[PDB]
Every structure is written in structure tokens, then in C-alpha cells.
Amino acid sequence: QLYCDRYLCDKVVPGNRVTIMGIYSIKKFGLVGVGIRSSYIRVLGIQVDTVSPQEEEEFRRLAALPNVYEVISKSIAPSIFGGTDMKKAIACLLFGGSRKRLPDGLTRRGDINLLMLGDPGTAKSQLLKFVEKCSPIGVYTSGKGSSAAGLTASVMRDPSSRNFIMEGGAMVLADGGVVCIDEFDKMREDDRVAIHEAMEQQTISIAKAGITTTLNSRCSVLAAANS
Amino acid sequence: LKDYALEKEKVKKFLQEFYQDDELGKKQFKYGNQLVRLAHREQVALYVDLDDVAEDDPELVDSICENARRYAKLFADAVQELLPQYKEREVVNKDVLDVYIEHRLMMENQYPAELMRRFELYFQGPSSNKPRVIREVRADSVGKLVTVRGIVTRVSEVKPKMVVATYTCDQCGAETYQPIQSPTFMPLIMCPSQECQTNRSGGRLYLQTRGSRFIKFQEMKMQEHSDQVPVGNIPRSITVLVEGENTRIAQPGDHVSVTGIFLPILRGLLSETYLEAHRIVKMNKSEDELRQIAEEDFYEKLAASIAPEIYGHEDVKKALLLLLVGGVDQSPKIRGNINICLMGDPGVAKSQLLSYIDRLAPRSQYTTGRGSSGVGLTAAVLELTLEGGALVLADQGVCCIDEFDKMAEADRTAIHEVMEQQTISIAKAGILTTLNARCSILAAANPPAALLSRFDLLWLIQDRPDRDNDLRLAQHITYVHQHSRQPPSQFEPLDMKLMRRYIAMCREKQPMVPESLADYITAAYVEMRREAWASYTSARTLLAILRLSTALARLRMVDVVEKEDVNEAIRLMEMSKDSLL
Amino acid sequence: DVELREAQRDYLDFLDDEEDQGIYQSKVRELISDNQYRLIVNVNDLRRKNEKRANRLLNNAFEELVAFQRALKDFVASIDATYAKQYEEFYVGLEGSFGSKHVSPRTLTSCFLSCVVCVEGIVTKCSLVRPKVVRSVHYCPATKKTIERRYSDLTSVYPTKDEENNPLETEYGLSVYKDHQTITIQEMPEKAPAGQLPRSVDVILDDDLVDKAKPGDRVQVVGTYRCLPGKKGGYTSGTFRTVLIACNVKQMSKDAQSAEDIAKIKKFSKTRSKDIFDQLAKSLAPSIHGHDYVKKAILCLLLGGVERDLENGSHIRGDINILLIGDPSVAKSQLLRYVLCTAPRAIPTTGRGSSGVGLTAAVTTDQETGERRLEAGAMVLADRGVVCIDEFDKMSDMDRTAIHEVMEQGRVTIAKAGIHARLNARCSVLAAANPVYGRYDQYKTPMENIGLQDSLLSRFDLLFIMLDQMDPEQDREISDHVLRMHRYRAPGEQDGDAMPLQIYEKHDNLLHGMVSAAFMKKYIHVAKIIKPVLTQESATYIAEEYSRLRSQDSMSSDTARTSPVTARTLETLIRLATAHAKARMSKTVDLQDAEEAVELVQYAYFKKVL
DNA sequence: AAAAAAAAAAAAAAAAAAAAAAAAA
DNA sequence: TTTTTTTTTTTTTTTTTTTTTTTTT
Numbered sequence A: 001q002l003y004c005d006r007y008l009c010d011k012v013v014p015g016n017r018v019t020i021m022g023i024y025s026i027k028k029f030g031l032v033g034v035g036i037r038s039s040y041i042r043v044l045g046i047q048v049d050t051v052s053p054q055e056e057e058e059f060r061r062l063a064a065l066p067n068v069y070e071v072i073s074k075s076i077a078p079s080i081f082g083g084t085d086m087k088k089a090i091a092c093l094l095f096g097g098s099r100k101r102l103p104d105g106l107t108r109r110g111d112i113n114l115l116m117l118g119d120p121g122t123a124k125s126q127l128l129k130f131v132e133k134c135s136p137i138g139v140y141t142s143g144k145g146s147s148a149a150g151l152t153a154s155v156m157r158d159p160s161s162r163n164f165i166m167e168g169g170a171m172v173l174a175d176g177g178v179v180c181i182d183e184f185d186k187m188r189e190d191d192r193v194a195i196h197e198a199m200e201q202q203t204i205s206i207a208k209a210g211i212t213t214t215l216n217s218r219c220s221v222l223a224a225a226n227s
Numbered sequence B: 001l002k003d004y005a006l007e008k009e010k011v012k013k014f015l016q017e018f019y020q021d022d023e024l025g026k027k028q029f030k031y032g033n034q035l036v037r038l039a040h041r042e043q044v045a046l047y048v049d050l051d052d053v054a055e056d057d058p059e060l061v062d063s064i065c066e067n068a069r070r071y072a073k074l075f076a077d078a079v080q081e082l083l084p085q086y087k088e089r090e091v092v093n094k095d096v097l098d099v100y101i102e103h104r105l106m107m108e109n110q111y112p113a114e115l116m117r118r119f120e121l122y123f124q125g126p127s128s129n130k131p132r133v134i135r136e137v138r139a140d141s142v143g144k145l146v147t148v149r150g151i152v153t154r155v156s157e158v159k160p161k162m163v164v165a166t167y168t169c170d171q172c173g174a175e176t177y178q179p180i181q182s183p184t185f186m187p188l189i190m191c192p193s194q195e196c197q198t199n200r201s202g203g204r205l206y207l208q209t210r211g212s213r214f215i216k217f218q219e220m221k222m223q224e225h226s227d228q229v230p231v232g233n234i235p236r237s238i239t240v241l242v243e244g245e246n247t248r249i250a251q252p253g254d255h256v257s258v259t260g261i262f263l264p265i266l267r268g269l270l271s272e273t274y275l276e277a278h279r280i281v282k283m284n285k286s287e288d289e290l291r292q293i294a295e296e297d298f299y300e301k302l303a304a305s306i307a308p309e310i311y312g313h314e315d316v317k318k319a320l321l322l323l324l325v326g327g328v329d330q331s332p333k334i335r336g337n338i339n340i341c342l343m344g345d346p347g348v349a350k351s352q353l354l355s356y357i358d359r360l361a362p363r364s365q366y367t368t369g370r371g372s373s374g375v376g377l378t379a380a381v382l383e384l385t386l387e388g389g390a391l392v393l394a395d396q397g398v399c400c401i402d403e404f405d406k407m408a409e410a411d412r413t414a415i416h417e418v419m420e421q422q423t424i425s426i427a428k429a430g431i432l433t434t435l436n437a438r439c440s441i442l443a444a445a446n447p448p449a450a451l452l453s454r455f456d457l458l459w460l461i462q463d464r465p466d467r468d469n470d471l472r473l474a475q476h477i478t479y480v481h482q483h484s485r486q487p488p489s490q491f492e493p494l495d496m497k498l499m500r501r502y503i504a505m506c507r508e509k510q511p512m513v514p515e516s517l518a519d520y521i522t523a524a525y526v527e528m529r530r531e532a533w534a535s536y537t538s539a540r541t542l543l544a545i546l547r548l549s550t551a552l553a554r555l556r557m558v559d560v561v562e563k564e565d566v567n568e569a570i571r572l573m574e575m576s577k578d579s580l581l
Numbered sequence C: 001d002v003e004l005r006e007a008q009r010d011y012l013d014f015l016d017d018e019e020d021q022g023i024y025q026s027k028v029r030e031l032i033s034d035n036q037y038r039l040i041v042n043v044n045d046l047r048r049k050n051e052k053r054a055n056r057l058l059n060n061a062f063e064e065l066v067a068f069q070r071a072l073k074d075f076v077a078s079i080d081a082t083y084a085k086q087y088e089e090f091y092v093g094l095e096g097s098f099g100s101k102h103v104s105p106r107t108l109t110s111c112f113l114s115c116v117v118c119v120e121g122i123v124t125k126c127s128l129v130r131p132k133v134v135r136s137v138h139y140c141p142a143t144k145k146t147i148e149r150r151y152s153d154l155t156s157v158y159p160t161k162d163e164e165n166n167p168l169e170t171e172y173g174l175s176v177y178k179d180h181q182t183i184t185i186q187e188m189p190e191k192a193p194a195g196q197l198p199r200s201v202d203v204i205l206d207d208d209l210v211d212k213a214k215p216g217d218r219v220q221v222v223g224t225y226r227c228l229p230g231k232k233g234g235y236t237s238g239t240f241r242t243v244l245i246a247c248n249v250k251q252m253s254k255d256a257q258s259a260e261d262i263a264k265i266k267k268f269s270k271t272r273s274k275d276i277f278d279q280l281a282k283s284l285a286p287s288i289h290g291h292d293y294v295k296k297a298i299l300c301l302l303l304g305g306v307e308r309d310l311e312n313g314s315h316i317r318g319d320i321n322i323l324l325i326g327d328p329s330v331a332k333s334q335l336l337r338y339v340l341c342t343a344p345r346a347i348p349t350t351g352r353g354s355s356g357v358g359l360t361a362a363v364t365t366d367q368e369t370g371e372r373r374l375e376a377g378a379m380v381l382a383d384r385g386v387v388c389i390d391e392f393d394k395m396s397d398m399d400r401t402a403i404h405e406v407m408e409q410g411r412v413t414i415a416k417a418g419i420h421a422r423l424n425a426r427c428s429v430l431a432a433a434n435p436v437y438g439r440y441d442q443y444k445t446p447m448e449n450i451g452l453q454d455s456l457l458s459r460f461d462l463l464f465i466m467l468d469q470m471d472p473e474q475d476r477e478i479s480d481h482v483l484r485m486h487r488y489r490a491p492g493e494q495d496g497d498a499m500p501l502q503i504y505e506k507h508d509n510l511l512h513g514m515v516s517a518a519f520m521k522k523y524i525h526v527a528k529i530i531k532p533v534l535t536q537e538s539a540t541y542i543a544e545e546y547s548r549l550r551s552q553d554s555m556s557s558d559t560a561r562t563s564p565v566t567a568r569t570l571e572t573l574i575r576l577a578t579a580h581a582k583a584r585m586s587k588t589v590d591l592q593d594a595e596e597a598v599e600l601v602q603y604a605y606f607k608k609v610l
Numbered sequence D: 001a002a003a004a005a006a007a008a009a010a011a012a013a014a015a016a017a018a019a020a021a022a023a024a025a
Numbered sequence E: 001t002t003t004t005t006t007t008t009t010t011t012t013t014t015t016t017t018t019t020t021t022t023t024t025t
């Protein structure tokens, strides 16, 4: 049990891989196990395991290159052979368009959605893995979500605490980034409808017995599939 | 600043010298007679109608409504002081507690007043006091006399609440008395009898229920009418603690206006609230000349008065009229209810008639589709008590079921029992009972032997297009939107309040089927048998004839059914079946 | 106390607003005239007039608020002592721009204790309202003595025996209570990080605020953040329980609700009393192109007809239900999104994102009192509002049949064995649909292009088929509109950067090659209150039109009904006519409204089959 | 279209950890 | 007066049943 303090609170969130330097201490509360005092760590130092102006100018000069598009195209899946057009398209998807909100308030999504149908021999799941490893914010998942990590967000009310717990699927977690859906043709009906709404509006609308809400899922979908 | 001896004098003056001419221009000293009846133990509740007080003392009524419990106690004590000078004879010892009271008085540190009252008093809210919505009854009205309207959602069972506990000592023989105001009380362990105090004895005294005082007690939760809930909110529920002669007056689902006191129960000093009921009135459908009733066309007039804004459907309304009246139960046990199912195409005003019956029938429930399903119809276990569903709340009433076809399969099975057995046999895990649901089912659905064989009448409605028929309906509907009142006709339709009395007046008129009509009815029945055979008619159809024929007999208020009713009853069968074809 | 006296003097001087624009003097006149005893003060005014006072108020909320309230009571006494004597205390609410205090329950750290905080959050808990006593009065029958005891706000002993042990009977009526409630507010799921659980905070509401916010509503609470103590005890843990003692609760739905604007509306209505409806409808969704009839119909949904309540308590809905079946990419979802953005109390939803008890209301057990409690569902929340149901077809049929009652009579009847209720749901449903087979087969009747049964199609008063016809001229026009929209950039505010994660508007050439959304909102809101009455000639015209519509002759060969024509259709006409009347502030449904609604219905109810 | 199997809701029961009050000496 | 054992309350979890939903013939 870790105990944080003034500025150590909320420096970590559950799931982080952390290194803690603290004071091994027991509770001191007005004093078959006899004389056992539950022990805890007094957190003093936290390290969570896993842009400078020079880099900004580096990016500026990188963009200015006449063949910046070519170097980016050949710089995404060098190990994978061929498919130059597909690599160019994936670069375009990574950079995405521009989100537009008209004066009336309507929004035009600026995130590109790409699909790849092919025989199971081509390196397309490898391509999705690279994309999720390269996009600033990115998540890999299968058609039926992932392992104990749903695809789309869900809302449930804690019967005891009666809160509105939002269990985030791949879409909401990947907000502002990329979701790489392998086996995109094997979704479940609820998820099929959810993505149907999300890919266009960029929002997942969920209304449960407790409340209605519209989670913001501004994710670029990169889907792989077989015939 | 606010004396109470003067208040006692004023209330005694009011009670002694107030009068009215209610009974045929006869000044009769309204409350003097009530006091006399109280002194003779022939009346237990004295309702002090504050309208009477305001007639001659507005400031006293203002103070009473501005402070409730104090003036309730003052009126109780004033009635107690007035009782001795109004008693005229000797009571016959109505109950055991009166015998105990007399023995205590004869054997007579004082007897608490509440131990010797045997008479309750309650205020009827002044007419000037508009009834207040439950949601708006807040801290500013704590202890005031407020009247609130609602729907009784759940009323607990009558139980004995002790007002004055009576203990007897094992040494001195004297009685110890303890008034009760808190929900819980500390029983006295030693006797404070002056004899034992002088003797310095153990004084361990034992509580006696023989001498103690018990009062009826019931707890209910009442909701807000759907018409008064805020736009984005849900109805709010308030607790009411009825006692004495205010118990067994309201059942679940009863629309009730209750005038009581908004008092908190002590638990900063945060405190819950409730209403201490003083006057309970059943409103609207729950509410509790002859020349027109004797008319030949009176049968048509009630029919034409059922949802007048619904044009046409002359025959259907006449059939629903019988459902409200219902047949007559015979116990040689055959039910006397009538079940009518309105099946038709969309937008033929099926639901409106179903909704209209709900606002007219005395006891009714309108459940739509799967919104109120499962335990919504039958009962459930909720100490663990048993709460009934729409059927139970609709027992001996009319349960208006809409979209019966799209109902849960289990619910349809439950109804099957009700429309034949008029009971609900549950053998679930936590439930094992046999409810009583003698309710008439009015089903609405859209397009069946599984359903035809059960309902006595299966009326089929088809709005087949027609140039002139549609035009008349459009004139009718557009008129309603233009004036909010059904189009004028030769006769003014009867108001719902008036209709309920008429229908109720016809219920307690059990008629009899003469031997003379047996040959006619048997002759009629056999023909009905062949038509379905030639072209479903079973023994049920004959019963449907008898129940319908009796229903007409009640409308004419003749204790003997006549051949005209059979013809009219069959005529409805003809149209009902002809609707299918 | 020199400091407290200075604070009160400064606050009173501020409230003494006659030399200045007279805003807060007018506000005090308002609060006294309408009989309320709480004032709302914009913090921006304090910052503009006295930065020291504003900073002190925000950083030390309790004593500063006490001084401000005392100054308020003194000022109201000066303006009127009769009213000021009625109320023991005059309270204050705050609002405006809270620089660093404006936070969420997540960001609410202990650093803000004893400060003023303007939090925004989703209400999770609303406890029952309880009367908390503040002043008790006890009467002794024996001694004839009435004793008053005060109870200061220490957020305890209740006398029962007189000095010589004479029982005291509390005087409930003469006792003074203030209604009090506790709510639990939560950070909006939209702004909460997607990973961790929601973070919440308590709020304590005194009188004038006990029921200002209902469960499941997005609210803004301005108040003081302090620590609660434990009960009396020799030992204590350094832990403290913190709550937000609210000084003001506001609904974030500012869209839910000046003489200049009213005059503008009046002049706009009177100028051209013929084509205001068309001008509005054309301006309804500027970003979208085409679909004039659909935009007209939606404009009727926003206005809605008029509800009729007969003498028998009968109900005839005055709201308009619209269905839009469309081929892919025809802007139906965009129109739903616009309706959400504009129409007040516009509840969104999707096909399978709201199953059964979620779409409509529900019933559960409190689980604490063991008492049954209702649950405001997706649509009961949308009372007197719009419900935008996208992907309508994919809904399970059970959900669909769970909407007929609310769609038709606008009330949801839910009853379990313990409890029963008929919640008010007077909402207009706007549904979007993708016809069976994905795309619309024009060589098939609209009946078989729609998998919905006849009854539900009857429920919807208007059913619009929006085909993806590619007529090269029409495609050119649509592409021009779209590309012009995609090129638009905000005026001046933007210069080539990216988006972070008046009666008539100015005429841009990139958006026009219309009326302001705010002006349209105001005009629609004011018009919605009008209650026109059908005219005799209009009634006859509508009756004849309905008679022909039912008649077979009204449909030629190879043209099929998009939905059955029944009694509801007639009402639709009226409602639509009524709607068209409200657009013109008519107060009387003349013939023009009737014939416009008639042509709209005729266009909607018949489709040509190739 | 209807039945069989699965999943989720919901309600009741248990653990339990900690703070406060009443009874005992 | 001061301790102590109980009392509660306040969360949380767990288990059974029922009901609701999904898949197959």
C-alpha cells in the first residue's frame, strides 16, 4: 500500500509500471495474529516506467525537403516489401486531414479512415502493428475488441456507489489518434452499430438507465480484413 | 404573546354555539350533537371542519393553519372538558377499554388525558387553503395544516401503536402510565408509586397490555399526479402516517387528497418528515335525475357519452359500456366480468378508448406493452410484505391492457388465468400464494384461436377508406381541435362524474334469467354454434350471451332479464363476429 | 473588527449602484419585487470595481460572504425595510469567470479549501430534502412559558425539560426550519480521462437551492470548499471530509432559456407575413445543401403543433415525429446533429446504445432504504424537447415497440409490484434510418424498402425518403456547396492553424456564393409560445384534403404510399398547419398554412416507383 | 415463429473496518 | 469520571434467483 502526499497525488494512474522510493512504515492509530500492524510505504519518489526548439527546427527543415513525401512514404514499413501506394496512403492517414466546425456548429471530421482487404498472406497485421507503434496516440485491437479491453466505450452504474463508471473501449482510449482494427469484418452487432456512428460523427452516444452522454472518440480507423 | 386559555375559551364557544340548517332548513347546533354522540360512545372521530370556524372567526383559523399540533391539542382538551356536561345517559360499555376507563375513574400523579379520551379529532382544511403539491411542501410549512393530493402507491397494514403504556407494580398495586410521543420509548423498570417510594421497595413493575392504550396505525407513500410533476422531473413521494379512524380508508392506487400536519421525526439536527393524516378523501375515479334513467334511450346515451370526441364506433362503445357494468356473478363459481379486446389497424382510436376507460372506471389500471410487465401485472414480495401489480390494484375493476399482442409471453399466460380463473397462482422462489384478481380485462392489439377462444368479445376495427365517411370524421376531428369540445349533437353527453354514479347505481342490481328465456337462449345459442361450424363457438359463447344479457338488464335496472336484452346482446355478437368478416 | 467593517463597507458601496450603470441596484429591485431572498452577483463586476475585494472574496469565502450578505441585507433594508424585515438573512450567489478556481471534481485539490470554486459536473446523487431546524420554540404547560433556542450554523442540545423539570412541548409551527439537501456531483465523462474511474465531490444546498438541480443533469455549482469535522472523540485521524457549500447552482443548459431583440422579432414577423417560414427553413441548416422539404418539416418539428387537452382529460399530442430514410451520405445524420446543437433539450441516441430500460425510464430499488425508485430514462429527460435517434433501423424491435406510447400520447407507464407511475414524456422524435439492403432500390415499393411494420410507420407523422440521385447538375451543386464549406475559415481568428483537441448574418462569398443561428433560436423560442386557432375555412380545406388523401384516386399508377393514411395523418395536417402558423406569429391558422402543410404531406406520403 | 441455452439485472446475504454511544465500575 | 463492549453505518463484495436476451430448428 502506497501513500502519496502534497504533490505526489495523481502523479500516477492505475496500470502504470512504477518504481517507488519510500519509507517502509506501519500504521500508527492509537495502537490469531497478535501485535501485527498493517504495513505500508510512504511514497517519496515516483518514476513511471514504459518538444525542444532544436527538434521544432528539425521538423521545420524536414518538411521543407522537396521529397518529404517520398522519405516519409519509404520510412514507415521498411521491413515490409512492396505496397508503395499503401504506404503512402497510411502516411496520409497518419497525418490526417483537418477537423472543420462550421458556423452552424456542425463538424466535418478530418481523420482519414482506411480499409485493407486481402489474402491472409500479405503483411497487413504487421502493418497495423507498426501503425499503432508509430502513431502518437494509437491502439491495436481485433474486431471483437481485445483481451479484456472492449472496442467501444460502455457505461455502467456501480450499484453500491451508484456512480457512472465509463469502461473505455479502444475507440475512446484512442481519442485524437489511431485505432488499428484487425479482423475488422468480425465485429459484434452492438459494436458494428457503435463504430457505424463513431467513424462519421467521431462521437459515441450512450444513454443508460442513469444518464445520456456523448463520449468524444476522434480516432482514425485503420482496418484489415480477409475476403 | 399567544395565550391558550383564551383559545380554549374560544374553541369551547365555537363548539357549543355553532349551528347550520343542513337538514331541510333546521338549525341543529352542528357540533353539539356530535359532542353528545361522542359522550355516548357512538362516535369516535370529531372532524372540526375549519370552514365552519372561519365563518365566524377568521383569525382563529389563520392561527390554527399557522400552528397545527398546539390547536389540535387545545381542541381535544376542550372536547374533553365539554363531554361531562353533554352526556345524557349511561353507556353500555361498548369495549373493554371503556370498562377499564370506568374502573380507573371509580377507583380514583394523575390519569393522562390521552389515556381517557376514546375520541379523536381532525381538521378539514379550509376551502381558502388551496391544496399544495407535494414537491412544494418544504421547511416553511413544517407543523402547518396543509392539504396535498396524490396517488396512494403503497399502504402498510393496520398495526396497534401504543399511545399510553400502562404498567402494574408487584408490590403497591398502583398503575404507572407513560404517554408515548417518540417512535420508541424506554420502558419503566421501577414503579414511582408513592406507596413504594415511601416503603423503599424494589418497585419492579411489569408492563400490562390490558390497561395500555392502543390506536390503529398505518403508513403509506403517496406520489404526485403526473399532471403536476415538473417537465424534466419524476413524481415525488411523501409519507403519511394514518391513525385511529383514518385507517383502512385508502388502498394502493387510490387518488387521495389528504389534509394533515407536516411534522418531522427526530433522528445539525437534520430531521425527516411525514404527514400526520387528519382528513382523507378519495378523489376522481376513486371518489365515493331518475326521469332520464327510466328513458328507453338511456342505454344509448351512456354509450354515446363514452369518449364523445371519438367519432363513430357506435357499437364498440356500447360493448365497452357493458364491460364497465359487467355481468352478474353466479355461485351454484362463474365470473361475471366481460372481456373485450379491440383489435384493429393503426390509428383507429383503440388507445384513446382504452385511456378513456381508465379515467372513468372506479378501479382501473392502464399498462402499455413491456413498460409495466412481469411483476407489474402480478404481485411480488417486498419484514417481507407482498405488493400487488396492476391486476391486483385493478382487482374488481377494469385493467386496460394496450398492445396485448406484443406483451411478454409469461404475462399473456398470467392473464389467461385471470380472464378464466380470476386469480394469480404464483409459486416462485420467494412467493407462494394465490392472489385474487376479479378484474375485467380490456385488451388492445393489432393483427388467433389462442386469443379468440378467451375473450367474450373480439371486436375488429378497420378504417377502410371512404370518400364521404372520412370527410365526416375530418369535420369531427378538426372541430375538436378548434373548440376542445366534441361536436354538438342532439343530446349533451354525460359528464364522467355523473356517469360513474349511473354505472355504480346499476351494479347492485343482480337480475335473474327467467325460465321463459331458456328456450330462446338455447335456440339462439345452437344457431351461433352452426355458423362457425358451417363457415369459433363453444360453451364460452353461451356464457358470453348470458353475461352480456344481464349487463343490459342492469342498465334498464330490471331485476328480470327480457328478450330484448338477449337480442341486443346477440346483436353485439353479430357485429363483433361480422367485424372479423 | 476593522477588517470585517471594511469588507462590509466596500460591499455596500458596490451594491449602492446609482452613480454607475445601476445594474445591481436594478438586481436588488428585481429580487425584492419578485419575492426572493437570494442575490446573484457576477464576480467579474467585483474584479472590475475592486480587485482586492474580489481576491479576498475568492480566497477567503466564509467571512467575506458573511460580510457581503450583511451588506446586502442593509442595502435591501435601505431600499425597503418592510420586505427586509420579512427574511432573517439575505443570501448571495456568485458567477462569472473564475480564473483558477474554475475546476472539475478531478482537479479539485485541497489547495482550494476555504476558497470560492465554480465547479462544473454531472449530478450523480440528489438526497431527499430535509428540514434542518435553526430556531426551536418550546412551550411549558405548567409554567405557561415559551422558550426560544437558536441553532447556529456549525456545519445541538434540544431542550425537553424546564428549569425545574417541567416537560417542554416543542412548538413545531412556530419553530423555524430551513430546507437542506446533499448532492454528489461528478466530472463530465466527456472531459474525464478515458482510463481511470470518475472523480466526484459532495455539495450541500441550503434553502433556495435544495432542488435547483436534479439527478443526471449537467450543472455548474459555485460555492465554498471546506472541511467537515468528525464527531466528538479523544482520538482523530488527520483525515478530513470535504464538501462544497454551494452559494449558487445553475443548469449548464443556458440554451434552455432584451427589448431590442423583442422589437427585432416583432419587426421581422410583421415585415413579410407570407414567406417567413420558407426563409427560416432555407436557413435551418446552412452547411447542408438541398432537401428543402425535409428542412421545412424539421422547422415544424422545432416549433411543434399545439397540444389539446379536452374536458374529459383526453390528450392529443401537439408534437411532430419525423423519420428520415436515406441512402448513405445524404446528410440525415448531419441534420440530426444540427437539431442536437440547436433544439433545446435535444437528447441524442443511437440504435443499440440505449437498450430497453435505458431509452425509456426504469424502476429500481434504492438499495439503502429498500424503497423502489424511478430512473429518468433517455427520453423522459427529453420532455418538452427533441429526441434524435440515429441508426433507428438497427434497434431491437422490443425497444421500438417500447416507444409507441411516448410517441403517440407522450407518457411512459412503468410499474413494478412495489411502485407504479406514468412519467411525462412530451418529446418529438426525429429518427434517421438506412433502408433495408443499405441503399434504396427505387425499383421496389417504399413499403418493402422499409422493414418497419405498418403501425410504426403510422406513428411517424412525416416519413421522408432522401435518395442519393446523382443527377450531374445536382452533383455539381452539392459538390460546390460542400467544397465551399470545406474551404471556409473563421473570420480573422484563424490564419492557417489547426483546431485544438443581428437579423441577417454577414454575407460571405465562401458560405453563400439567411438568418443568424442565434436570431433564429430566439425567434423560434418566442414563436413556440404562440397558440393559433384553426379557422373554419382552414378546417374545411384540411377536411377535403384528407378525404382525397384517403381516396384511391389521390395516388396515380406506379406511385405508392410511403406510409398508410389514417386518422393520425389528419392530425398531422393540423399540427403541421399549426406549426406553419406559429412561424408567422399568426395566432390564427389561415388557409396558407393549411395548404403549405397539405403540399408537405402530399410530397411526404407518396413516392414514384420506377 | 418458437424453444433452448446464455447473459445480465437485480435483490438479498455476508464480511468487515472503523467511528460513536451506553452501560459498568 | 473513565473504560469497555457494543452499536451502527457505511462500503464493498458475493451468491442465488429471476428475468431478459441471443442463437438454433
Ligand SMILES: Nc1ncnc2c1ncn2[C@@H]1O[C@H](COP(=O)(O)OP(=O)(O)O)[C@@H](O)[C@H]1O
Binding pocket: A079, A080, A081, A082, A119, A120, A121, A122, A123, A124, A125, A126, A127, A224
Ligand atoms: N511484403 C512483405 N514484406 C515483409 N514481410 C512480409 C511481407 N508479406 C508478408 N510478410 C511476413 O509474413 C507474415 C504474415 O504477415 P501478417 O501481417 O501476419 O499477415 P495477416 O495480416 O494476414 O495476418 C508476417 O510475419 C510478415 O513478416
Ligand SMILES: Nc1ncnc2c1ncn2[C@@H]1O[C@H](COP(=O)(O)OP(=O)(O)O)[C@@H](O)[C@H]1O
Binding pocket: B309, B310, B311, B312, B313, B344, B345, B346, B347, B348, B349, B350, B351, B352, B353, B477, C315, C316, C317, C408, C567, C568, C571
Ligand atoms: N374514430 C376516431 N375519432 C376521433 N379520433 C380518432 C379516431 N380514430 C383515431 N383518432 C385519432 O388518432 C389519434 C391516435 O389514435 P390511437 O388511439 O393511437 O390509435 P390506435 O391506438 O388505434 O392505433 C388520436 O389522437 C385520435 O384523436
Ligand SMILES: Nc1ncnc2c1ncn2[C@@H]1O[C@H](COP(=O)(O)OP(=O)(O)O)[C@@H](O)[C@H]1O
Binding pocket: A108, A200, A201, C287, C288, C289, C290, C326, C327, C328, C329, C330, C331, C332, C333, C334, C335, C478, C481, C482
Ligand atoms: N446534400 C448535402 N449537402 C451538404 N453536405 C452533404 C450532402 N450530402 C452529403 N453531405 C456530406 O456527406 C457527409 C455524410 O453525412 P452523414 O449524414 O453522416 O451520412 P449518412 O447520410 O449516410 O448518415 C456529411 O459530412 C455531409 O457533409
Ligand SMILES: [Mg+2]
Binding pocket: A120, A124, A125, A182
Ligand atoms: Mg491477420
Ligand SMILES: [Mg+2]
Binding pocket: B350, B351
Ligand atoms: Mg395503439
Ligand SMILES: [Mg+2]
Binding pocket: C332, C333, C390, C391, C432
Ligand atoms: Mg448516418
Ligand SMILES: [Zn+2]
Binding pocket: B169, B170, B171, B172, B173, B174, B191, B193, B195, B196, B203
Ligand atoms: Zn409499587
